[model samples]
Target chain A: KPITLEKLVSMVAVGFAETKAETATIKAETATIKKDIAGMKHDIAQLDKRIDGLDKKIADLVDRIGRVESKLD
Target chain B: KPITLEKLVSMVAVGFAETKAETATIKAETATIKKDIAGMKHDIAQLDKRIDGLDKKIADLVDRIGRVESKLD
Candidate 1:
């Protein structure tokens, strides 16, 4: 039997509602992921700072070692 | 004029289609962000390894300098 116009309209209405709900859920999840990304970026930045501090201290120690070696020569 | 049943059905169909397209776009953007996050994590791990290497070298140097100072005493 051919589908009636009434059934087609009802199907479209139901699908539209379902899609709207899915969209809202996806939006909320995306927002949460973005917040997580921001947190990761903050952590990486702090790690970089600590690494830089270590780098500077290492360079200073190397310089001091060179000076001591020269005095021993 | 009140919306005809046919018009309401058409509007719902169009809205649903638009929402699907928006969802696809958001999903693609999210995939890209995930890729970027992975790259950042890899870089951070590499940095961590390098920092570890530097830390070991600094420790070795300090030990060597201590030995040298003891020999000179």
Candidate 2:
């Protein structure tokens, strides 16, 4: 157990070198996933936007049809 | 240059040991992001399902309203 601090520092340097690239790659993967999540949320908003137009159409149709039916009945 | 093969093997073992935990943490982060992706997709499908119910209501309303108008005119 008499190993000098030199050996300890070298061990850390070698270990960090081996793992640094792997950490960076994983970080990049995380970044891509975050991007995808943002893209998907934007897509969902666009998709939901489509429904608004249809909903308005339905609302107007229902109101007009209700008036017509009430007048006939 | 009298480094023995034992030193070489020990260096690798020590280095790998030091970085193993960090590697596992990054791997777990990837797993979490994948899980988030899957969850988001499921939520999107559910959202689309809600639109289907609204769409059906509008279709039925349009069909019935058309019949009433045709009978009136």
Candidate 3:
């Protein structure tokens, strides 16, 4: 059975609509995932700052200790 | 309201193929996201180690200072 050109065109249109809908959904989901990734990166930066503070505190303590040690010796 | 069985079958086949392709694409994207998450976790671990080492170095210096102070008095 040969299909008419009109029928083929109708099928192609349906296919196009469905594909477009799926593509839109995929784009939305990708945007959401990218936002999540950005949040994770922000959290990591916060952690870096906190750790940096801790490192500075440690350095200060070490410096104070060196002064005391030199005076004693 | 009468469509041929063959036309319906063809439409269904095309829909199924499109959905399968979309699903494959989505899965690949998710896999990439997972890989990125893993890499971020590894980076955090490395940062933790560096910070922990700094803490230990500070602690050692403080201890030495304490000993010197004790001897001085």
Tens digits of per-residue lDDT for model 2, A1-73 = 6655577668767777768877888888888888888988996997779788787887799797888878787
lDDT of 1 by residue, B1-73 (tens): 6546779767876886798788888889789788979988897898879888997988889897997798778
Which ten residues in a row are the worst by lDDT in model 3 chain B? B1-10
Candidate 2, residue A54: how far the Cα is off, in Å: 3.2
- lDDT of candidate 3 at residue A71, scale 0 to 100: 68
Q: Please identify which of the two predictions, 1 or 2, would achieve the higher DockQ against the true structure.
A: 1
Regions of model 1 farther than 4 Å from truth: A1-8, B1-9
The TM-score of the first chain in every model comes to 0.80, 0.71, 0.80
Superposed model 2: Cα runs more than 4 Å off: A1-13, B1-23
Model 3 error, position A41 (Å): 2.8
Residues B1-73, candidate 2, lDDT per residue (tens digit)? 8975557657767768767876887799799879979898888888888888888888888888888888887
lDDT of each: 0.82, 0.80, 0.80
**For each candidate, what TM-score against the reference?**
0.77, 0.68, 0.66
Q: Write the per-residue lDDT of candidate 1 for residues A1-73, one digit (tens) a residue.
A: 7976677667777987887788888888888888888888888888888888988888898888878877877
lDDT of 2 at B20: 81
The candidate maximizing TM-score is 1
Candidate number of the best lDDT:
1
Which 10 consecutive positions of candidate 2 chain B have the poorest summed lDDT? B4-13
TM-score of 2: 0.68
